[PDB]
Amino acid sequence: SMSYSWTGALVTPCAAEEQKLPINALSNSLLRHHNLVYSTTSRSACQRQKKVTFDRLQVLDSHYQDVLKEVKAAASKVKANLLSVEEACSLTPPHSAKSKYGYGAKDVRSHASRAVAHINSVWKDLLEDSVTPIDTTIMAKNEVFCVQPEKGGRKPARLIVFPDLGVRVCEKMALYDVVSKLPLAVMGSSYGFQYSPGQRVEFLVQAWKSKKTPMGFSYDTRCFDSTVTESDIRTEEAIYQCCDLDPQARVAIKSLTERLYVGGPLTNSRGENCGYRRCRASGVLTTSCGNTLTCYIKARAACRAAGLQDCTMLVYGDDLVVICESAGVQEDAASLRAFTEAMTRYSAPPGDPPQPEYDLELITSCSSNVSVAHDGAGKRVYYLTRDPTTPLARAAWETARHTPVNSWLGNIIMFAPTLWARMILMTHFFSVLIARDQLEQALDCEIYGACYSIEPLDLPPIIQRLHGLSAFSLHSYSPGEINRVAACLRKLGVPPLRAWRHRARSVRARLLSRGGRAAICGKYLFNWAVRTKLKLTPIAAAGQLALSGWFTAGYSGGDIYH
Ligand SMILES: CNC(=O)c1c(-c2ccc(F)cc2)oc2cc(N(c3cc(Cl)c4c(c3)COB4O)S(C)(=O)=O)c(C3CC3)cc12
Numbered sequence: 001s002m003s004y005s006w007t008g009a010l011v012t013p014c015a016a017e018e019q020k021l022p023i024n025a026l027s028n029s030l031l032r033h034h035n036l037v038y039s040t041t042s043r044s045a046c047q048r049q050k051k052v053t054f055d056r057l058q059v060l061d062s063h064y065q066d067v068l069k070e071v072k073a074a075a076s077k078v079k080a081n082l083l084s085v086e087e088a089c090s091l092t093p094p095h096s097a098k099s100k101y102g103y104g105a106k107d108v109r110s111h112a113s114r115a116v117a118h119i120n121s122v123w124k125d126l127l128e129d130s131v132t133p134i135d136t137t138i139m140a141k142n143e144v145f146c147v148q149p150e151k152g153g154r155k156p157a158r159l160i161v162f163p164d165l166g167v168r169v170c171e172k173m174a175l176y177d178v179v180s181k182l183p184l185a186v187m188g189s190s191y192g193f194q195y196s197p198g199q200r201v202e203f204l205v206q207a208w209k210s211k212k213t214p215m216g217f218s219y220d221t222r223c224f225d226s227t228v229t230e231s232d233i234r235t236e237e238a239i240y241q242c243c244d245l246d247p248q249a250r251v252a253i254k255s256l257t258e259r260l261y262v263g264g265p266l267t268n269s270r271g272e273n274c275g276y277r278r279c280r281a282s283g284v285l286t287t288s289c290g291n292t293l294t295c296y297i298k299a300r301a302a303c304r305a306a307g308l309q310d311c312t313m314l315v316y317g318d319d320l321v322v323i324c325e326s327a328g329v330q331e332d333a334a335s336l337r338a339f340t341e342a343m344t345r346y347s348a349p350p351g352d353p354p355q356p357e358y359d360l361e362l363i364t365s366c367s368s369n370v371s372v373a374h375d376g377a378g379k380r381v382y383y384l385t386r387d388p389t390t391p392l393a394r395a396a397w398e399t400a401r402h403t404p405v406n407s408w409l410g411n412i413i414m415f416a417p418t419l420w421a422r423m424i425l426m427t428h429f430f431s432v433l434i435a436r437d438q439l440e441q442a443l444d445c446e447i448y449g450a451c452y453s454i455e456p457l458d459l460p461p462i463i464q465r466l467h468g469l470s471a472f473s474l475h476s477y478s479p480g481e482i483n484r485v486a487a488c489l490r491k492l493g494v495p496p497l498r499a500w501r502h503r504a505r506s507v508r509a510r511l512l513s514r515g516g517r518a519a520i521c522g523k524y525l526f527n528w529a530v531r532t533k534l535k536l537t538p539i540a541a542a543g544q545l546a547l548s549g550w551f552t553a554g555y556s557g558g559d560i561y562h
Contacts, residue, residue, distance in 0.1 A: 003226035004053045004266075006275040011045035011140050011159065012268040018401075019043075021144075021393075026435065027400035030392065030428050032493030036147050037393045040157035042140035047156035052226045056279075058347040063301040068235065071297060074186045075242035080177040082246045085119055086111060088172035092165075093451040093561035094444065095404040097137075099165035108169060115166075122166040123173065126255040127248065133264040136161050136281060138274050146393045146492065160557070162283030163260060168559050171285040174252040178240055179289040180553045186239075187296050192316030193288075193448060193554035196466045197414055201382050204323075204370060207312040208360045213326040215356050217336060218365045219299065219343065222351040224318035225280035225287075228294060229347055233262045233280070235297075236290045261286060288449060288554035291317045298346040306339035314365075317556060321365045332356045361480075373417070374476040381470050383417040385481060388424070388488050391415070395425055399432055409445040409454055416463040417471040420485050423497050426525050427504040429456075434510055439518060449556025457517040460524040461542035472524050472536050504529035517541075 021027070021037035031037065083091075089108050098104035099118065107115040140157035147154060162168070183191050195203060208214045221227060237257040241250060261284060266274040280287060296315045303311045303322065310325040322339075326332055336356055343349065357363050360370050368386045375381050395408045408429060415421040433439045433456055445454045454462075463471050489496060504526050511522030520541075523534055549562055 001230065001278050002053065002055055003223075003279040004049070004275055004277055006049060006053070007273050009268060009272045009274045011042050011049070011138055011274065012270050012272070013042045013140070014269050017041040017043075017142060021397055022400045024400035026432055027396045029431075030399060030424075030494060031396040033491070034396075036492065037144065037396060038147060038154055039142050039144050039397070040140065040155060041142060042157065044154070044156035045140045045159065048140075048159055051156070052159065052223050054223075054226065056227065056229050056347050058229050058231065059345045061301070061305070061342075061345070063304040063342075064297070064346065066304075067297050067301045071186050071293070072239055072242045075182060075239050078178075078181050078185045078242075079244040080181055080249070082249050083173045083176050085116060085123075085169070085173065088169045088176065089116075089119075091172050091176065091561055092169060093405070093559060095451075096168070096559055096561075097162065097165060101164065101166060103165070105165065108165065118166045119169050122164075122170050123252070126170060126174075126252045126259075130251070130255045130258055132259060134163055134167060134260045135267055136163050136260075136264055136277070136283075138266040138268055144390075144394045144397045146389045158282070160283045161266065161277060161281040162557075162559075163281075167260070168285070170252070171256060174249055174256060175240070175285050178243060178245075178253075179286060179555075179558075182240070182243065183289055183292055183553060186293065187315065190296060190313045190315050191292070192314055192319070193292070194551055196551050197384050197416075198467045199551070201370065201384055203314070204360065205382055207314075207323045210312070211310065211323065211325045213358075214323060214360070215326040215332050215358060216321065216323040216360065216363045217354045217356055218363055219320045219322070219339070219354050220351045221295070221318055221320075221343070221348045224291060224295070224348065225282055227348045228280040228291070230262050230278060232294050232347075233257065233290070236286065236293060237261070239293065260284065261290075283557045283559070285555075285558045287557045288317055292554060295320055295348075298343060298348055302339050302342035302346065305342035306335045308335055308339065316366055317554065319366050321363060326358070329356075371478055371481050373474040373478070375470045376473040381417075381474060383467070383471075383474070385415065385418045387484060388418075388420040389492065391420075391425065392488065392492055392494060395428065399428070405444040405446050405451055407446055409443055409456065410447040410452075413447070413454075413459070413462055413466065416467050417474050419477050419481060419497075420488075422474075422525070422528060423500045423504070424494065426459075427500050427507055427529075430507050430511065430521065430525075431503060434507065439514075447550070448554055449558060450560040450562055452562050457521060458541070458545070460520050461539045461545050462547070463525075464539050464542040465545060465547055469536060469538060472527055475528075501529050 021034040092108045094105050096105035101118050103115040139160045141160050145155055240253055263278040265276055268274050292315055299320050308324045312323045314321045336354055368384050371385045373381050391411050398406050398408050412421055412425050442453050442455045445452050508522045508526035511518045527533055
């Protein structure tokens with residue numbers, strides 16, 4: 001069937017959409033080529049709609065059915081609980097999309113009468129009705145990028161599809177405990193979300209080293225969400241039901257599957273009927289878990305069909321990397337073509353064909369790659385990096401304009417060991433926070449798709465836990481990484497690293513003078529900026545911080561707050 005059917009009605013904005021990076025003195029200090037920086041808007045929705053709309057042809061085979069049996073067996077070891085209304089309410093982020101039925105996220109979080117009343121009725125309806133499709137809103141995501149003229153100009157807006165706030169809370173009640181436990185249980189070491197950046201790096205390096213002659217590749221499925229069929233989504237339901245569940249949970253899960261997850265009508269912001277969906281909804285609780293599971297099942301089956309030897313997989317939503325034992329250059333190339341053929345048959349063809357890589361650093365996944373630097377003693381230290389263009393573009397935007405839930409803070413935490421994150425982003429954002437007298441204010445940040453409340457002053461302990469003490473002492477970065485950063489700075493009109501160093505010395509001084517946690521920020525985060533280096537010992541606060549929930553599971557588009 002067709003992934004979508006359209007009425008011809010437009011995807012419409014809620015509010016004013018800014019296309020270009022606003023001019024602001026503080027943002028300009030980071031990035032001056034503002035004309036290169038743009039935000040996606042509803043104006044490009046039609047372009048996206050065209051790309052994501054196609055007929056799915058799915059043919060399953062014995063390898064697929066074999067893996068699915070394995071998955072169901074693994075799922076059967078899981079015991080999952082219903083969450084209460086109150087519990088589910090508290091997992092709702094403050095800026096979550098308000099209900100059409102007279103309440104919003106603040107009302108949900110405060111357990112307000114009108115909110116809870118509607119939620120209770122939605123739950124009841126789920127238990128009583130297992131067939132009537134549930135309405136969804138379609139919106140155009142507003143995301144910031146840098147223009148790449150050679151690569152076809154401007155990216156079209158991604159489409160987000162989500163049900164009403166009331167339904168979203170009910171999803172949590174039925175499935176939050178399932179999506180939290182199931183992927184790890186089924187996928188084990190292949191489950192990407194379980195790892196901190198430091199752990200992820202270690203996993204990849206050990207996997208690579210475990211092979212006599214390693215070969216690796218990333219597999220990029222074209223429009224993954226659209227490739228997910230009705231049968232795929234119903235299979236996900238079957239897997240969920242393999243758990244030991246509450247009787248009411250079982251009913252609600254089936255209802256949510258048939259009325260929401262498998263498909264439904266699409267309504268724009270003006271209440272107009274846009275069309276009908278027969279594929280994955282981006283904005284539901286099970287999007288992350290579902291995508292990861294389905295990708296895993298298909299990939300694991302495809303590895304067998306392709307005759308890949310001693311496979312180690314890593315899966316994060318629709319992002320997939322396979323590391324295996326090489327059979328020779330031409331043998332590997334053919335096996336990879338076979339892998340693609342199998343994945344295609346499973347309804348997941350690639351955007352660009354995958355290529356075998358024989359160097360770990362050459363593999364790009366989740367926009368990221370492994371690189372090497374050196375610690376204080378001169379020991380080789382591996383870390384995850386990425387092209388800084390998009391992070392810098394977004395950093396500039398989020399400086400110029402207040403965004404309720406930022407991306408810059410998460411970005412800094414996750415890419416803390418990187419040259420660009422340390423010298424540019426840390427320096428810039430601490431300078432901005434100081435200038436605006438916001439150093440002590442907690443911020444709402446997006447991490448692995450989930451909303452977190454983070455205090456900037458807690459950066460050092462957080463970084464220590466996620467990356468190790470070495471993150472504060474890395475030097476002698478690779479020529480390739482240095483060159484990539486350099487190219488980005490020239491492109492975006494960002495001051496050179498030596499200028500940032502100077503600024504960092506000032507910021508460091510200001511932070512040290514304030515004392516306490518601020519002083520620790522100055523000491524640890526900016527030790528690179530001084531010749532006379534301070535002795536970086538383990539941070540006492542780091543041990544105390546409760547960070548376990550961080551890398552328990554993936555909640556992207558899942559409307560989750562921690
Ligand atoms: C299946 N692939 C993987 O699991 C990952 C590989 C990878 C695997 C194999 C390989 F060969 C190369 C890269 O690298 C990763 C790096 C991250 N990292 C990111 C963190 C952030 Cl805030 C962003 C990004 C990445 C991209 O743009 B950002 O919005 S990180 C630094 O580890 O936290 C992630 C996180 C979960 C998304 C996943 C993967």
